[PDB]
Amino acid sequence: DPRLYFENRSKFIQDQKDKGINPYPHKFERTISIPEFIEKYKDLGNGEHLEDTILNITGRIMRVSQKLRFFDLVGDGEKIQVLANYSFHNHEKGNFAECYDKIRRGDIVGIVGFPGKSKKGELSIFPKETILLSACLHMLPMTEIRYRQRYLDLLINESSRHTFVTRTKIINFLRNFLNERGFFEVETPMMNLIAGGANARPFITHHNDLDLDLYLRIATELPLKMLIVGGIDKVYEIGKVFRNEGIDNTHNPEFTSCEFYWAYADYNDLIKWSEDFFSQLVYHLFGTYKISYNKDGPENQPIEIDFTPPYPKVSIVEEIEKVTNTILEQPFDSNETIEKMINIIKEHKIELPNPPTAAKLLDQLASHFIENKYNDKPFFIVEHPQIMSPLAKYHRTKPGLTERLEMFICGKEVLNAYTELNDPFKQKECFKLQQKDREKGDTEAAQLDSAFCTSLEYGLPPTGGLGLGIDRITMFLTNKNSIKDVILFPTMRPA
Amino acid sequence: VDPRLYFENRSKFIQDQKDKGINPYPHKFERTISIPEFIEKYKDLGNGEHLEDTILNITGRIMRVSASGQKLRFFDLVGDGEKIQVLANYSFHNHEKGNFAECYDKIRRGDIVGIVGFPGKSKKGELSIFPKETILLSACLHMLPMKYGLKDTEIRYRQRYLDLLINESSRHTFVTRTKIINFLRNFLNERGFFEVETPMMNLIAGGANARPFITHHNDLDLDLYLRIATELPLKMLIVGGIDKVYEIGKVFRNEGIDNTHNPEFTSCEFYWAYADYNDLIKWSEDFFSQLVYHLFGTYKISYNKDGPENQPIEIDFTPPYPKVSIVEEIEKVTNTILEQPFDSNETIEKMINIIKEHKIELPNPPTAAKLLDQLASHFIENKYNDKPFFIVEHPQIMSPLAKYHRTKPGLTERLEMFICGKEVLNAYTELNDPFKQKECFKLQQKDREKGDTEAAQLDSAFCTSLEYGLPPTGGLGLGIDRITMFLTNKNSIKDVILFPTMRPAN
Ligand SMILES: O=C(NCC1CCCCC1)c1cc(=O)c2ccccc2o1
Ligand SMILES: O=C(NCC1CCCCC1)c1cc(=O)c2ccccc2o1
Ligand SMILES: N[C@@H](CCCC[NH3+])C(=O)O
Ligand SMILES: N[C@@H](CCCC[NH3+])C(=O)O
Ligand SMILES: [Co+2]
Ligand SMILES: [Co+2]
C-alpha cells in the first residue's frame, strides 16, 4: 500500500529530524559525474581495485539487493553498481548495517569511496561512507502518468531522455543551420493587439493596467516581415505560438515553430532550402537518409521514410481535378465551382465544411485526396489558390494561384512557405476578401492588421518566408505517434 | 511637401506603372553580391578606377537622391547596415532597356532597387556601383523621415522598421542583444547544461511573486495562467534526472509598464544539481565578467545612468562583487534592530515607523515581507553604482522557494544581483524538503488571504514532485532585457525590445 509506504517515509524523515540529523543536507561536493566515472574506469580488470583513489560521487538509487550490500546508482541516464563492503566501511562515521538498512529505491545519495570492478567484472563504486542527500518518499514504479508526472517518465523510461535529447539536438541544428547562413535571430511579441499571420482561433488575455485585451500570437509572420522592411534581410524566430483549438495526436494548443524571412529569395530558393535542411538534419541525426516510422502504432508494422532529395511537388488544384476527374474553374468561389466542390465532397462522404466557403472546400478536398499521397517520402503540395493564401504572392505565370509550398511527412504538415506578398495594394485587397469571408461565419479568417499594411507601404523587398513545426518534425525523428510524447509538459485537464 | 499628397502621388504612380504594363513589384531579382561583400571586395580600388568588365547584380534601398545636369544621377544605396554610392552615368546606360532620364527620374528615397552594373570608384574616390540598368523592386510610398528627425517620438517603438532603417545605433543595439543571448546559451551549453522548453500556459502561475495574465482554452473549457517564471517545471526536470537544465524564453507579469518593466520579457533560468549558493555567486561573477569582456575587450563599461545629456558613470564588472546582507544592512542604515519573528508586533511596528519617518510609501497590505521589501528597495538597492553587487540572505518569509540558511535562523541562501540599482539576477540554494515547502506555501496563502495578491499559490503537482526526491540544487534567473539595457547604454527597456507593449495607434 503506497499510502502507508509514504506515511512511513514521512515519519522516517521526521524521526531523523527529531534526533538532530539533517536528512536534506545543503551541499555535497562531488568530484566526478557517473558518465565521467564510467568513461574513466570501465577499462578496469575484473576484481581490480583502486583503493587509494578516493572519489565523491552522487546519484539516485534505483535498485536495492548482509555484510555485502548491492545497489544500482543512476545519473545523467547512466548507471553504475554500488558495492558496499563491511570491510571497507569507515566505522568512525557510524554503524554499517544501520547506514545501509535505511536506503530505499529512489533515494538520492552522496558516496565517498573508490572505483573498482566486482569479480564478475561489473564497474562499481566501493563506498567507505554513504550519506542520504534527498529521500524518495513514494514508491517509484518499477498511462497518463508519463504526461502528468514527466519526472517519473524521465527516471524510469530510458527512451524518454533520448527523445527529449533528440528534440534539443533538432533545435540546435536548426539554429546553427540558420546562423551559419547569416540569419539573425530575434524575439517578437507573444501578445498582440491583433492575431495574424495564419488562419486560426486565438487565445485572449487581458492587461489590467492598460485595460486592454490582448491576443496570444498564432504565428510570427507579420512582425518578422516588418523587420525585413527595416533592413534585417535574413531574420528568424524560434518560439511558441498558440492556437485555441482541440487537442489530438498532432495538435497541442501551444507549440514550437520556427519562421525565417529571407530577402531577395523566392519560392524556388525555399524549396531548395527545405530539401537541403531536412536531408541534412536527418543525416546529422542518423547518418542515413532513411528512417523507420511506426505510423500506425508501436507494435504494428513500421514504414520507411526516405529523406533523399529531391522531393515530389504536387500542384493542388491540378491534382484535385485529376483525382476527381473534374474541372474546377476560376473564380474558385463562383456558384458553379462551389456547387461542384460541394458535390465532390458529398459524393465521397466527407464532412462538408462549415461554412462551405471556397477556401474551406478546397482545403477539405486537399486534405482528403492529396495530403496522404506519399508516405514513403516527404513531399510538397504547391501552387495554392490566392483565396487560400492571403499573404502569399500571386504566381508569376498562373493566374489565381500563389508561389506557395507546404511540406508533408506521412500526411502531416510540417512546413509552410511562400514568396511573400509585398504589394500593399494587393494586401489590403486580400484582407478585404478575408473579412467578407469572416462575415460569412469563418472565425479563422484573417483580420486587417493596419500596422503591418502600413509597413508594406514603406517597401518590403521581394522576400521568401518559411515556417516549420518543430514538434511534428521531432515526432517523426524520434518515432512518436503522438505530440504529447515530444512535449515535456503537454497541456492536460487537471486530474 | 505634404506627406499625404506624397503618398497619393506614389500610389497613383504604382497604378500607372501597372497600367503601362510595368510590374513595379518583380517576383525575383537574382543578385550576385551583398553590399557588405561588395565593400569588402572593392574598397581598395584606386580613385577613378572602373572594373567595367565585371558585371554584378546588386540590391539595396535608396537613401539619398541627387543629380548633376542631364547625364549624371547619384544615389546612396544601403543594405545590412552598410552603404555604397550609385553613380548612374548616361555613358554606361543600357539604352535598350529604356530612356535614361525617365528611368532614374522615377526613383525616390526609400525605393528598393536591383542594379546591373560594374564596381568602381569615382574620381573623388567614392566606392560606387556604376549601373547599366536599374530596376524598381519595391517602392517606398511614404516620405522617409531623415536622421535625427526621429528623436523624442514614439515612432521608434510603433514603427521599429523606421528606427532600424534610419538610426544606425538601433541595428547595433539589437545585434548586441542577440550576441548576449548567443553568448549565454553557449556559456551554459559548454558547461553541460541541457536547454528545454516548459509550458507557457499553466493551471497555476508559480515560481515568483507576481500577478499573472489569464486566458481560456475553449475546447477543454479551461482557464489557464501565462507563466510568471520557469522555476517550478525546471525543478521538476531536476527531479527527473536532467541535472543541469535551463530555459531562455518569455515570461509574463501583469503589471504596469515603465522604464524597466514590460509585461512580457525574456528571462533565462538554470538549475544545477549538487550546486549551492556559493557556486551560484561564482557562476554569476564568471558569467558577467566574461560576457562584458567578450563584448567590449575590457571589464569596465560606461553607462549614461541619467540620460544621454548627463555624464556617464563607469561600471566595473571585475570580479568579485560586494555581498550585502539585507537585514543587517537595513538595520545598520536605519539604526534599528529588527528582531525575529519579522512578523511580530514589535518588529512590524518598527518597520512601519521607519517607513513613516523616512516619508516612503507604505505597502498595502503591510505584511512583514512587503515591509522588508520596501525598506530594502529604499535603503539598499542603490548602495553601489560603479559595480554590480549582491543583496543576500533574504528572510524565509520573503523567499518561499529558497532553502533555509545553514547557519542563520530565519534567513535563506539567496542572492540578487543589482546593476545601477536594478535587479538583473535572482538565485538560491533550492528548498528541496517537501514538508517545509508545503509549510511555506501555507504561510504565503495566509499572506494572500490578508490582501497580498502576489502571494505564492499552492502548487500540488510541484510539492508532490518534491516528494520523489529533489537533490540538493542551486537555481538562478537572469533578466535578459535589463542586462541588455546596461550593455547597450539604454535607460529604457523599450529601447532593447523590438516591439515593446503599447496601446493601439490612432
Ligand atoms: O506543427 C504544426 N503545424 C505545422 C506548421 C506550423 C506553423 C508553421 C507552418 C508549419 C502544428 C502543431 C500543432 O500542435 C498545432 C496545433 C494546433 C493548430 C495547428 C498546429 O500546427
Ligand atoms: O528583468 C526583470 N527582472 C529580473 C528578474 C527576472 C527573472 C529572473 C530573475 C531576475 C524584469 C523585467 C521586466 O520587464 C519586468 C516586468 C514586469 C515585472 C517584472 C519584471 O522584471
Ligand atoms: N505563418 C505561417 C508560416 C510562414 C509562411 C511563409 N510566410 C504559418 O503559420 O503557417
Ligand atoms: N524564478 C526566479 C528566478 C530563479 C530563482 C532561483 N530558483 C524569479 O523569477 O525571480
Ligand atoms: Co491545413
Ligand atoms: Co524586488
Element (H, E) at B303: strand B300-303
- From CA A489, how far away is CA B21, in angstroms rounded? 56
| Per-residue cell: A304 | 520507411
Give me the phi and psi of A164, to 5 degrees please: -75, -30
Q: Are A2 and A138 in contact (CB under 8 A)?
A: yes
CB contact under 8 A, A208 and B254: yes
CB contact under 8 A, B159 and A454: yes
- From CA B5, how far away is CA A344, in angstroms rounded? 51
Measured from the CB, is residue A107 less than 6 Å from ligand 3?
Answer: no
Give chain A's radius of gyration (CA, Å).
29
- From CA B131, how far away is CA B50, in angstroms rounded? 12
User: Which class for A493: exposed (0-12), middle (13-18), buried (19 or more C-beta within 10 A)?
Assistant: exposed
| Ligand 1 atom index nearest CA of A414 | 4
Ligand 4: centre distance to CA A422 (Å): 43
| Per-residue cell: B80 | 545590412
Residue in A5, A149, A102, A10 with CA at minimum distance from that of residue B436? A10
| Ligand 2 atom index nearest CA of B424 | 4
| DSSP label at residue B72 | E
- From CA A459, how far away is CA A225, in angstroms rounded? 11
Measured from the CB, is residue A109 less than 6 Å from ligand 3?
Answer: no
| DSSP label at residue A247 | -
Residue in B157, B459, B480, B205 with CA at minimum distance from that of residue A205? B205
Q: After which residues is chain A broken (C to N over 2.5 A)?
A: 65, 142
- From CA A95, how far away is CA A430, in angstroms rounded? 80
Give me the phi and psi of A39, to 5 degrees please: -60, -45
The one-letter amino acid code at A179 reads: N
Q: Is B354 helix (H, G, I), strand (E, B) or coil?
A: helix
Element (H, E) at A414: strand A412-419
Q: Are B496 and B177 in contact (CB under 8 A)?
A: yes
CB contact under 8 A, B11 and A230: no
- Asked if B69 is an interface residue toward chain A (Cβ–Cβ < 8 A), one would say no
Contacts of A186 in chain B (CB under 8 A): 174, 178, 498
CB-closest option in B237, B250, B499 to A223: B499
- Asked if A264 is an interface residue toward chain B (Cβ–Cβ < 8 A), one would say yes
- From CA B94, how far away is CA A455, in angstroms rounded? 33
Mutate which of A199, A257, A414, A415 for ligand 3 pocket (most atoms within 8 A of beta carbon): A257
Residue in B192, B324, B433, B36 with CA at minimum distance from that of residue A137? B433
- From CA B431, how far away is CA B439, in angstroms rounded? 11
- Asked if B240 is an interface residue toward chain A (Cβ–Cβ < 8 A), one would say yes
| Ligand 2 atom index nearest CA of B493 | 14
- Asked if A271 is an interface residue toward chain B (Cβ–Cβ < 8 A), one would say no
- Asked if B372 is an interface residue toward chain A (Cβ–Cβ < 8 A), one would say no
Q: Is A15 helix (H, G, I), strand (E, B) or coil?
A: helix
Give chain B's radius of gyration (CA, Å).
29
- From CA B402, how far away is CA B271, in angstroms rounded? 13
For residue A326, the distance in angstroms to the closest alpha carbon of chain B comes to 31
Q: Is B423 helix (H, G, I), strand (E, B) or coil?
A: strand
- From CA A85, how far away is CA B425, in angstroms rounded? 46
As beta bridge partners, residue A380 has A313, A407
For residue B467, the distance in angstroms to the closest alpha carbon of chain A comes to 5
Residues with Cβ < 8 Å from A343, sequence gap 6 or more? none
CB contact under 8 A, B217 and A462: no
Task: Centre a 10 Å sphere on the Cβ of residue B176 and count the other Cβ atoms it contains.
Answer: 16
| Ligand 2 atom index nearest CA of B262 | 14
Structural domains of chain B sorted by starting position, each given as residue range(s) with its CATH number in brackets: 1-148 (2.40.50.140), 149-500 (3.30.930.10)
Q: Are B461 and B431 in contact (CB under 8 A)?
A: no
CB contact under 8 A, A244 and B14: no
Residue nearest to atom 10 of ligand 4 (CA): B426
Residue in A141, A151, A152, A139 with CA at minimum distance from that of residue A9? A139
| Per-residue cell: B243 | 541535472
| Per-residue cell: A317 | 488544384
Measured from the CB, is residue B253 less than 6 Å from ligand 2?
Answer: yes
CB-closest option in B24, B138, B242 to A461: B138
Annotated resolution, angstroms: 2.0
- Asked if A423 is an interface residue toward chain B (Cβ–Cβ < 8 A), one would say yes
CB-closest option in B198, B434, B498 to A186: B498
